[PDB]
Amino acid sequence: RAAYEADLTAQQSPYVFFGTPLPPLDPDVRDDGSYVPIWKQEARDERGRKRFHGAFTGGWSAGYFNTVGSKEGWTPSSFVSSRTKRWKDDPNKVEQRPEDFMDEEDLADLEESRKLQTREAFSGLGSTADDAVRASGLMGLFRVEGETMGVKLLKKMGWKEGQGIGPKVRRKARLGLGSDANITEETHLFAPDNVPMISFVRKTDHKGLGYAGETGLTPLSKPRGSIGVGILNDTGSDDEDPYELGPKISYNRVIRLPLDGFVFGKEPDPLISEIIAEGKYPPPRIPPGWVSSKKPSTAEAAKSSTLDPRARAAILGEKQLPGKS
Amino acid sequence: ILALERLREAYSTKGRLNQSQREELALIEQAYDSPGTTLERIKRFLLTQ
Amino acid sequence: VKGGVWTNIEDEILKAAVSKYGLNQWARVSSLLARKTPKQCKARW
Amino acid sequence: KKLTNAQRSGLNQIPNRRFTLWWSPTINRANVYVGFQVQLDLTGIFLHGKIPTLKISLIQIFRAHLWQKIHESVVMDLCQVFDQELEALSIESVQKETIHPRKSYKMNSSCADIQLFASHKWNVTRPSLLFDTKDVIEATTTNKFWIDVQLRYGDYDSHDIERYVRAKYLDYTTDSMSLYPSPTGLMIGIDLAYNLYSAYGQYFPGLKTLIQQAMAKIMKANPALYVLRERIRKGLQLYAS
Amino acid sequence: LRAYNPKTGIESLTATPVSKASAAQRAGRAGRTKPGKCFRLYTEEAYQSLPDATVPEIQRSNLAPIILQLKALGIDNVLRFDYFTPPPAEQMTRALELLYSLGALDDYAKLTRPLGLRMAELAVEPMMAKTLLSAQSFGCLSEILTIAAMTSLDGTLWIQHEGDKKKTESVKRKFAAEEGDHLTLLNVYQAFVTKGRKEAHWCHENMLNYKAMIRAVSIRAQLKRFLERFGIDVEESLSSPSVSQQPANKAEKIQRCLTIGYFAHAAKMQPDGTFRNVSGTTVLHAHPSSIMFNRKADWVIFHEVLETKDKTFIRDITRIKKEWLLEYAPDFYKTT
RNA sequence: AAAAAAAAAAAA
RNA sequence: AGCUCUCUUUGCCUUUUGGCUUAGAUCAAGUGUAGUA
């Protein structure tokens, strides 16, 4: 029946010259790659049969058919040494690693426990873990950001955090002495301030602008650990605590007629009003006597463009960043 | 709040709900989110049903 | 959604499943349908 | 997930297996009223009666010749200790003996699995425990030594490894089924279920303290005991912090 | 409006209230031919706290192509640059982190030996421009040059036929590849160019557009010219019938180069069907246009992430391996 | 005035 | 009147639902997008 699925895949997906074609959409041939929820999935082993094999993974057998041995058996490798051929200075030191004594299940669980995370110098997608550090008060005043290296490379070229970017601002100061303008105003070159970011509130509803909406009601309040009762006998978590009844009680310490539903604007929009208005700019005088002085490829130049940015910015009058000196 | 709290004591126990229990939990959460519409529905049911 | 207004297609599938299955088997009849519970099919009948 | 009845029953059965593995020294207790004692195959664990839950838990803990591998790892790490300490004890050549791949779980008799050759006659003392201090050196001299390793899985009513090594030395030297070559030697004993260790036998001077340091090092840093402890920790799901 | 989050690193297409100037233009677009009426659906006091102008576009975009272009012009002092409105002080830090991860920049915030110049002049998203540079050293170049033609493309290839549901799946399965969604685009390009003889009605039965994808053909030609100016010779083996190289190694070579490039956009699929980042914090879902909407995978890369009304989707799903991430991102990712 | 197998782990 | 042809009608059951119990017992479900070109 391999020829039937083979030429059915050839007929349904003829132009697959890259990757692997999908199995055909038919009731006869199942879809192995399709994701069928979890409440629809079945527990199968490496061989496809529906059984378990561990004692702590829900099987009625364990090991090599209820035996702690193996089909290949065990053979103790030998060890001989003397003053002449001493073991410590031999070149082929076969070391006694904790993996000769393990099994494929042990290695599988070892790599299962070994997770993946980004390095300290690079930030990842969706990383939101600094709020607990920052929203702590005096605890967060000592724990500063651990120098993600983009901030460090901006630091090297002349940036200090707490202020924005741009050309340097020539404002004198504020000393905390109110708004005194009697200062000499000799105007040191400061750094531009940081404009804040934007954070739009999530909008899934169709509720309009300025609408408060209906407010909700809150529910009426609400050697560590133990050996479990089973993942299927946990039912509704009938056990919380035997020694006292109920949840944790939190305590205080004290004791033309317009359209229907539309109102007429009391004032017109100014922004549409300057469209037909004369504006606030008088046109130029234009005295008689002025005369127009001017009487009435890119790809090839880009190919010949040998101007590297070291020499491209030289004619642009820009100061290059300091390098390795 | 009291009515919904005593309705939760049966089924707020997490796990192994049938379809009607899940519908009840969805209805209770919907009533928690929008109390006024639920109260208007209840009063209409008392008047009419 | 489990529930909703009843359509003519759902009504005719309900009648056909009642024909094939009877009145004491509502879970099968609801299993022909998609948006209706056994109790809702029984109430509609 | 959609589970069959046997899979569901095994999944329900897992916490009982964890509870039985946790309480196994008092469940697989030596002092029983009745019960046919049977040795679990390829290990040194004696089961009294038929407890399938305890048996399947101990099969999961000891998968793939782990008793034999613990024995091999202990004898090899003692071999590297003796290899790095030939000079201080005048050891001529050290090798470990291998004909039977059955010695680890043989509780009837035993063999010798480490040999030491002496360039000069050693004035060994009386057979004494590993932590004895009242050493009495006698006039008898020897020219060869053996080291024997005995694994043991104890229980609540029998985990005294001191009496175990002493009685097994007094039993395993006068017995003719044991094939110990040299008349003088030392037998160490390792209780896996309680992580205990001891020895009984003669001592040429400079062996007792070396065996003490090597035994502490191998109890804290055995790869095979590390695999055993990690399998036990996964079986219990008892983590540290 | 689209707003690239600087801390997380995802876009957010969210429903922002309109600005005063935008609403004024919307009102003034009515009375063009005859005097009309304006029907803004909010109160008059709601047209009093609205923003006067829209949010600056330089403040809610990924600055990494912009910093790339600025260093291409030679202005490397992006901190001291005469911006019209300055971007806020930590968005370009994320941009510089992204540019350092994508080769390009050194430890001294400078555009490097022409690696950085080769990502500088290409009109591609710098992620897979980095891929296309790190393609020639590892063999295949023309296949992901084709994928580069397909990626730099806004309006989708498939004509959205709502009347066909199983037929759209079948014609998407006519060129389907299990090893990701990029190979499907490569397959449809090879079907159009090699055997299709540049014919539009064939695309009309295949539920595909014509103008944007022949534009993508021109884009592939332009990028081939651009890498011709890079000094690397072009290995066009697609016209040759030399199929003696095994295609499984070629496919994993293409996706291996892709995860050499796309190591930053890495995710792992969870049992409940959703995806999750390497940090394991934000919930991601497959976009309902990619080939892996119902398919099961373990580790994936995606071309771009966008936040809809509530779900955060990821596009162009491609299967990868975890050890590929641990091998080709040694300074970005580390195991425990 | 002193008590300790089976279901149930499936027909070239 | 009988014999044959076709049709109708009557009779016809021509294979015309192997048992029992707690109606034997239970039984929702992935996802599903698209400011701007």
Side-chain angles (χ1 to χ4, degrees):
Chain A
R1 53 184 181 268
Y4 178 75
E5 52 93 16
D7 66 355
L8 192 49
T9 314
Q11 185 262 332
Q12 280 204 0
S13 56
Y15 211 92
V16 187
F17 293 99
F18 294 92
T20 294
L22 303 190
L25 287 172
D26 276 286
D28 312 314
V29 190
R30 64 195 66 83
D31 200 354
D32 294 337
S34 174
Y35 169 77
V36 211
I38 274 270
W39 50 98
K40 300 265 140 291
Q41 278 192 271
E42 296 176 353
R44 317 193 87 96
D45 66 337
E46 316 295 325
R47 299 185 178 276
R49 53 179 66 237
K50 302 203 285 171
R51 79 178 290 250
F52 295 138
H53 190 57
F56 310 117
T57 80
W60 291 111
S61 177
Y64 179 45
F65 296 89
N66 281 106
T67 306
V68 302
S70 193
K71 180 192 271 191
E72 293 83 3
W74 185 71
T75 318
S77 62
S78 61
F79 181 85
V80 294
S81 62
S82 83
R83 288 264 178 82
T84 70
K85 188 175 289 295
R86 191 175 285 269
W87 159 256
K88 69 172 74 177
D89 53 351
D90 291 331
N92 46 2
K93 293 295 292 296
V94 294
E95 274 319 298
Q96 194 169 178
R97 220 169 66 250
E99 273 88 6
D100 314 328
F101 312 114
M102 280 191 191
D103 194 6
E104 51 93 14
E105 298 288 345
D106 291 331
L107 304 179
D109 307 337
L110 198 62
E111 58 93 24
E112 169 71 36
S113 89
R114 264 194 311 260
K115 68 193 187 307
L116 194 40
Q117 77 266 63
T118 186
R119 275 255 168 88
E120 305 298 320
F122 293 99
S123 63
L125 268 70
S127 307
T128 43
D130 299 336
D131 196 12
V133 172
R134 285 283 101 184
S136 62
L138 73 164
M139 176 156 39
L141 289 177
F142 203 94
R143 285 208 298 271
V144 194
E145 190 264 314
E147 283 188 352
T148 49
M149 184 278 288
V151 173
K152 287 201 289 288
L153 62 93
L154 203 58
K155 269 182 166 313
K156 187 265 292 180
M157 61 80 71
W159 181 73
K160 167 246 190 189
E161 69 275 16
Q163 43 91 21
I165 74 159
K168 287 184 69 63
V169 189
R170 193 174 281 275
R171 51 177 204 87
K172 172 59 168 67
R174 81 291 183 276
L175 277 296
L177 301 166
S179 46
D180 280 8
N182 78 303
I183 309 299
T184 70
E185 305 277 315
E186 57 86 19
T187 72
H188 305 279
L189 272 193
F190 284 165
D193 292 330
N194 195 3
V195 62
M197 316 279 192
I198 46 158
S199 299
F200 304 119
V201 191
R202 179 168 276 196
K203 194 75 170 64
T204 42
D205 47 354
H206 298 135
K207 294 156 78 199
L209 282 165
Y211 188 66
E214 171 66 272
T215 184
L217 282 176
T218 174
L220 185 63
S221 72
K222 272 85 62 183
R224 193 166 63 254
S226 64
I227 307 192
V229 302
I231 203 65
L232 307 180
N233 321 113
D234 198 1
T235 55
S237 181
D238 302 326
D239 61 357
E240 299 98 343
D241 183 82
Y243 295 130
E244 69 275 15
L245 189 66
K248 173 61 180 292
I249 303 164
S250 291
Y251 290 115
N252 280 105
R253 297 183 69 251
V254 55
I255 207 173
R256 177 71 188 92
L257 182 67
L259 210 68
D260 304 332
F262 288 95
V263 295
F264 207 96
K266 43 190 289 185
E267 291 104 8
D269 186 25
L271 299 179
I272 197 167
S273 86
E274 293 92 8
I275 299 184
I276 57 172
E278 293 290 325
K280 64 90 176 179
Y281 182 76
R285 75 287 183 273
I286 321 291
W290 183 257
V291 64
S292 67
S293 299
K294 286 186 182 292
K295 299 289 94 175
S297 70
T298 44
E300 285 167 328
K303 286 176 185 187
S304 63
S305 182
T306 56
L307 289 172
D308 50 350
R310 296 294 178 266
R312 197 184 275 128
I315 65 171
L316 297 175
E318 293 296 310
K319 301 287 99 175
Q320 190 49 259
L321 292 177
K324 199 165 193 174
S325 80
Chain B
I1 285 161
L2 292 162
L4 294 170
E5 215 68 36
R6 274 69 174 174
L7 287 183
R8 290 297 290 290
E9 286 165 9
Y11 301 142
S12 60
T13 57
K14 55 95 177 179
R16 299 320 300 182
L17 319 169
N18 68 277
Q19 198 282 294
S20 184
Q21 288 172 26
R22 268 175 313 250
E23 184 178 1
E24 198 181 309
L25 280 192
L27 278 172
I28 289 154
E29 294 293 328
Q30 174 204 297
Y32 265 110
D33 293 332
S34 60
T37 311
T38 294
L39 284 160
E40 271 149 37
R41 164 169 54 77
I42 287 170
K43 292 172 167 70
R44 186 193 329 127
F45 280 5
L46 298 175
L47 294 174
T48 61
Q49 211 186 14
Chain C
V1 57
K2 295 297 278 191
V5 71
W6 276 87
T7 68
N8 186 282
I9 298 103
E10 276 166 330
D11 281 345
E12 292 305 316
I13 295 166
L14 174 42
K15 292 168 87 70
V18 159
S19 190
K20 211 255 184 175
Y21 283 122
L23 304 176
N24 295 318
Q25 290 194 345
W26 291 114
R28 318 194 164 193
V29 180
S30 72
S31 71
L32 280 74
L33 292 181
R35 280 180 316 236
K36 306 290 186 267
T37 74
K39 193 183 178 190
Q40 277 163 348
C41 301
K42 164 165 193 174
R44 181 57 155 176
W45 169 260
Chain D
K1 290 185 179 181
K2 291 174 70 175
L3 304 157
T4 197
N5 189 359
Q7 282 182 322
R8 183 177 292 171
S9 181
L11 207 67
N12 285 220
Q13 184 62 255
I14 297 173
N16 289 347
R17 308 198 187 150
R18 304 201 167 123
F19 176 83
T20 315
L21 176 76
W22 180 243
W23 289 96
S24 66
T26 189
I27 284 168
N28 214 14
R29 179 209 273 256
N31 297 356
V32 294
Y33 187 78
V34 291
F36 180 51
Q37 186 191 80
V38 57
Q39 174 156 347
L40 178 55
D41 199 30
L42 301 156
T43 65
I45 297 160
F46 285 115
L47 302 153
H48 305 78
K50 279 158 152 169
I51 303 107
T53 293
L54 160 71
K55 201 211 179 192
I56 192 164
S57 294
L58 281 185
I59 282 163
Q60 186 72 35
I61 294 307
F62 277 98
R63 294 182 319 281
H65 304 272
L66 188 153
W67 190 283
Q68 292 164 340
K69 286 169 189 179
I70 282 185
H71 189 250
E72 184 202 20
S73 188
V74 172
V75 303
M76 291 203 164
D77 274 345
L78 261 183
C79 276
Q80 286 70 61
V81 162
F82 277 138
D83 179 61
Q84 280 74 244
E85 274 280 81
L86 268 75
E87 295 88 2
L89 277 296
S90 194
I91 310 292
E92 187 191 77
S93 54
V94 62
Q95 82 270 16
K96 67 102 173 179
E97 190 276 331
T98 295
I99 182 67
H100 311 105
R102 312 312 173 131
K103 181 204 179 292
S104 46
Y105 60 104
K106 182 174 73 175
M107 308 297 141
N108 306 5
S109 53
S110 181
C111 295
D113 44 5
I114 282 181
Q115 291 185 0
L116 301 178
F117 301 120
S119 64
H120 307 318
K121 293 188 176 182
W122 288 331
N123 294 12
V124 289
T125 81
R126 280 200 182 187
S128 66
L129 293 167
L130 188 153
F131 294 101
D132 282 340
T133 55
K134 302 180 182 181
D135 281 315
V136 179
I137 308 177
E138 289 196 324
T140 313
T141 70
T142 188
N143 218 12
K144 205 199 301 275
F145 213 82
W146 49 264
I147 294 278
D148 185 22
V149 176
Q150 285 286 275
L151 286 185
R152 167 187 211 221
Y153 186 95
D155 58 75
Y156 185 62
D157 283 332
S158 62
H159 50 253
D160 197 358
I161 195 70
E162 294 293 328
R163 295 179 66 250
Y164 188 73
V165 298
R166 156 183 292 278
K168 199 145 289 294
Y169 181 79
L170 294 174
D171 193 7
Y172 275 22
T173 57
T174 69
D175 169 64
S176 68
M177 185 64 72
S178 291
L179 61 84
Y180 298 170
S182 161
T184 48
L186 175 70
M187 194 172 54
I188 73 156
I190 304 304
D191 195 2
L192 304 182
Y194 283 80
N195 282 190
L196 297 193
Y197 75 114
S198 293
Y200 198 63
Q202 300 95 10
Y203 296 107
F204 49 90
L207 181 66
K208 186 192 280 279
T209 65
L210 187 148
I211 281 299
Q212 282 169 355
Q213 172 246 321
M215 275 294 93
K217 184 71 163 62
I218 180 56
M219 293 282 87
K220 279 73 176 175
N222 201 358
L225 291 196
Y226 172 82
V227 181
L228 173 67
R229 289 190 192 112
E230 284 305 311
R231 287 183 181 185
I232 288 185
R233 283 164 188 182
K234 184 177 180 180
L236 298 167
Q237 294 297 289
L238 173 76
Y239 293 95
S241 56
Chain E
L1 275 185
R2 183 177 289 121
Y4 172 84
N5 196 284
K7 306 303 290 182
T8 80
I10 59 171
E11 308 290 340
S12 64
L13 192 54
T14 52
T16 308
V18 296
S19 86
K20 207 87 76 170
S22 294
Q25 193 176 8
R26 285 155 171 237
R29 269 288 293 111
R32 303 288 299 276
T33 64
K34 67 177 74 174
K37 270 84 68 179
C38 178
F39 277 92
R40 297 160 172 173
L41 280 186
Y42 37 86
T43 68
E44 206 172 7
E45 69 266 10
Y47 203 68
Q48 278 166 226
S49 300
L50 276 186
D52 56 356
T54 66
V55 166
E57 283 276 343
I58 208 168
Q59 292 191 25
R60 46 173 179 92
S61 67
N62 212 26
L63 272 298
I66 295 91
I67 297 183
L68 187 153
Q69 283 157 94
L70 277 186
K71 295 186 87 80
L73 276 296
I75 301 98
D76 301 348
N77 203 337
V78 290
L79 163 71
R80 303 290 168 227
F81 182 78
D82 292 331
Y83 292 101
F84 190 72
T85 58
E90 65 262 25
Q91 192 171 13
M92 73 291 291
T93 68
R94 192 47 165 271
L96 287 156
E97 284 269 338
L98 197 146
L99 294 174
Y100 183 82
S101 60
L102 271 52
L105 300 188
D106 55 352
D107 207 3
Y108 293 99
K110 295 202 295 289
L111 205 63
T112 46
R113 188 269 299 164
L115 176 65
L117 272 299
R118 282 150 165 168
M119 283 74 75
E121 72 96 18
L122 289 176
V124 190
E125 188 176 2
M127 186 64 72
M128 169 199 192
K130 167 69 175 296
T131 312
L132 265 295
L133 188 153
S134 294
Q136 317 100 25
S137 50
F138 207 63
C140 50
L141 181 63
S142 300
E143 291 86 9
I144 68 166
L145 179 70
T146 297
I147 305 177
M150 326 318 302
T151 43
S152 307
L153 183 147
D154 201 6
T156 177
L157 286 89
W158 277 257
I159 304 183
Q160 187 64 43
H161 275 244
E162 292 90 9
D164 291 332
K165 258 76 177 175
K166 275 76 69 178
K167 190 178 183 294
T168 43
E169 288 159 44
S170 70
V171 303
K172 272 160 150 294
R173 278 214 37 187
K174 205 84 168 297
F175 305 98
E178 187 74 87
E179 282 308 306
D181 203 15
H182 296 167
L183 295 190
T184 307
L185 319 172
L186 175 48
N187 277 328
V188 303
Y189 185 87
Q190 204 194 11
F192 176 70
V193 166
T194 58
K195 65 96 175 179
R197 317 147 306 271
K198 307 272 288 178
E199 208 281 329
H201 182 54
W202 171 77
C203 300
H204 295 162
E205 292 92 8
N206 287 265
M207 295 298 102
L208 287 152
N209 207 358
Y210 195 55
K211 276 84 60 184
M213 61 80 71
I214 65 176
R215 156 180 161 80
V217 178
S218 71
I219 287 164
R220 198 190 183 278
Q222 279 155 328
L223 270 296
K224 182 183 173 182
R225 286 190 310 123
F226 281 177
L227 61 87
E228 273 160 358
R229 267 85 68 188
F230 281 167
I232 296 91
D233 55 354
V234 187
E235 306 295 323
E236 284 291 327
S237 71
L238 274 80
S239 48
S240 65
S242 64
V243 183
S244 61
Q245 278 197 358
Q246 69 275 17
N249 193 271
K250 170 252 290 177
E252 62 86 19
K253 211 177 195 181
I254 288 159
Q255 74 197 0
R256 186 180 295 275
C257 289
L258 276 159
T259 176
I260 281 182
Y262 272 81
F263 63 95
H265 282 180
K268 187 181 87 66
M269 183 177 177
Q270 314 297 115
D272 53 356
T274 75
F275 295 81
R276 203 147 286 128
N277 45 356
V278 182
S279 87
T281 52
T282 48
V283 179
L284 321 177
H285 309 248
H287 208 289
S289 44
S290 194
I291 201 174
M292 272 195 159
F293 197 43
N294 289 298
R295 316 296 288 176
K296 265 193 283 190
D298 205 14
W299 280 90
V300 300
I301 60 170
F302 52 92
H303 177 75
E304 57 89 20
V305 54
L306 61 93
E307 180 177 358
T308 54
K309 46 177 76 174
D310 80 6
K311 284 170 65 175
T312 317
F313 293 86
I314 50 181
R315 270 277 301 159
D316 284 329
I317 305 299
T318 300
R319 186 180 294 169
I320 51 170
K321 292 186 177 184
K322 184 183 171 176
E323 59 87 19
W324 289 347
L325 273 297
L326 277 173
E327 181 198 359
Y328 299 125
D331 297 331
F332 204 97
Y333 291 117
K334 56 99 175 179
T335 190
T336 304

